[PDB]
Enzyme design. Structure first.
Site, mmCIF file in Angstrom:
data_model
loop_
_atom_site.group_PDB
_atom_site.id
_atom_site.type_symbol
_atom_site.label_atom_id
_atom_site.label_comp_id
_atom_site.label_asym_id
_atom_site.label_seq_id
_atom_site.Cartn_x
_atom_site.Cartn_y
_atom_site.Cartn_z
ATOM 1 N N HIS A 1 72.887 30.463 -10.734
ATOM 2 C CA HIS A 1 74.309 30.777 -10.972
ATOM 3 C C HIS A 1 74.821 29.966 -12.212
ATOM 4 O O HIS A 1 75.949 30.269 -12.641
ATOM 5 C CB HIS A 1 75.156 30.574 -9.730
ATOM 6 N N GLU A 18 71.325 11.540 -21.318
ATOM 7 C CA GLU A 18 72.804 11.352 -21.342
ATOM 8 C C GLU A 18 73.213 10.363 -20.261
ATOM 9 O O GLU A 18 72.759 10.367 -19.133
ATOM 10 C CB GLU A 18 73.483 12.680 -20.970
ATOM 11 N N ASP A 59 68.856 30.664 -5.503
ATOM 12 C CA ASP A 59 69.665 30.136 -6.621
ATOM 13 C C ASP A 59 68.871 29.114 -7.398
ATOM 14 O O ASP A 59 69.075 27.918 -7.306
ATOM 15 C CB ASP A 59 70.992 29.553 -6.084
ATOM 16 N N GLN A 99 82.104 21.267 -8.202
ATOM 17 C CA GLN A 99 82.030 22.059 -9.440
ATOM 18 C C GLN A 99 81.607 21.213 -10.606
ATOM 19 O O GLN A 99 82.131 20.133 -10.809
ATOM 20 C CB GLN A 99 83.480 22.605 -9.692
ATOM 21 N N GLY A 100 80.691 21.724 -11.371
ATOM 22 C CA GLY A 100 80.164 21.019 -12.558
ATOM 23 C C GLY A 100 78.922 20.247 -12.262
ATOM 24 O O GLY A 100 78.209 19.851 -13.172
ATOM 25 N N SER A 156 76.725 21.738 -10.248
ATOM 26 C CA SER A 156 75.787 22.847 -9.984
ATOM 27 C C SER A 156 74.600 22.791 -10.898
ATOM 28 O O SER A 156 74.690 22.493 -12.073
ATOM 29 C CB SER A 156 76.477 24.128 -10.215
ATOM 30 N N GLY A 157 73.457 23.131 -10.296
ATOM 31 C CA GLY A 157 72.165 23.087 -11.031
ATOM 32 C C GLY A 157 71.490 21.766 -11.058
ATOM 33 O O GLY A 157 70.282 21.719 -11.397
HETATM 34 CA CA LIG Z 1 76.070 10.826 -24.599
#
Ligand SMILES: [Ca+2]
Length: 223
Positions: A40, A52, A84, A174-175, A177-178
């Protein structure tokens, strides 16, 4: 992640951010060329960001590598979120190092009650909205199949598990996801869905990665 903690820079070295001009989902580096995420989270024009911590500051350990291919599971159903899962191939291999590292795929499925590490840059509020810049983490236990099915009647397939806290207060959101659910040092889950975030009786639902290892291995052997 609601109710989590600041992980610490690069302490989750397999966590990636998927960027299409902005962070929009997590993923997990499974080897120098491939990321696992949620179907999704599919978008065209994905750049994978590895290494990161703060996604709004270039801190010096990042690698930004465009996707060359994305492969949604052949049986993904976007209505139910069954299957998914997605693979994303990098245009060039990541340089693996102490801050950018792959996570092992599982050999066996994880056990109910196992505490897993869930991470991401998703919303940190159950009611309302606040997106963090630095990576957040949460330890959450896998719940029993029967408790998961009681929480979401008629919605849980054999390719999903629940994890979290039925009292509320701690969840992915939310955010996230994955992104990864890591249990005993293996990628066991993908942040997939749930009703709201951190609400009572509505734990997170996660793609059961151990059901997909043969698809993942055949697909990476062929692309
Ligand atoms: Ca960074």
């Amino acid at each position: 992640i609601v109710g989590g903690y600041t992980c610490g820079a690069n302490t989750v070295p397999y966590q990636v951010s998927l960027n299409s001009g902005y962070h929009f989902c997590g993923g997990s580096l499974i080897n120098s060329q491939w990321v696992v995420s949620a179907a999704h989270c599919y978008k065209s024009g994905i750049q994978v960001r590895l290494g990161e911590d703060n996604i709004n500051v270039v801190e010096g350990n990042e690698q930004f590598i465009s996707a060359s291919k994305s492969i949604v599971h052949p049986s993904y159903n976007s209505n139910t979120l069954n299957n998914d899962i997605m693979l994303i191939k990098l245009k060039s291999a990541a340089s693996l190092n102490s801050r950018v590292a792959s996570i092992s795929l599982p050999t066996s499925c994880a056990s109910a009650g196992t505490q897993c590490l869930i991470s991401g840059w998703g919303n940190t509020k159950s009611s309302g909205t606040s997106y963090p810049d630095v990576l957040k983490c949460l330890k959450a236990p896998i719940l029993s199949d029967s408790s998961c099915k009681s929480a979401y009647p008629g919605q849980i397939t054999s390719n999903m598990f629940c994890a979290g806290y039925l009292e509320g207060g701690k969840d992915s959101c939310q955010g996230d996801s994955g992104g990864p659910v890591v249990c005993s040092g293996k990628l066991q889950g993908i942040v997939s869905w749930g009703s709201g975030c951190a609400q009572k009786n509505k734990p997170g639902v996660y793609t059961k990665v151990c059901n997909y290892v043969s698809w993942i291995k055949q697909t990476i052997a062929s692309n």
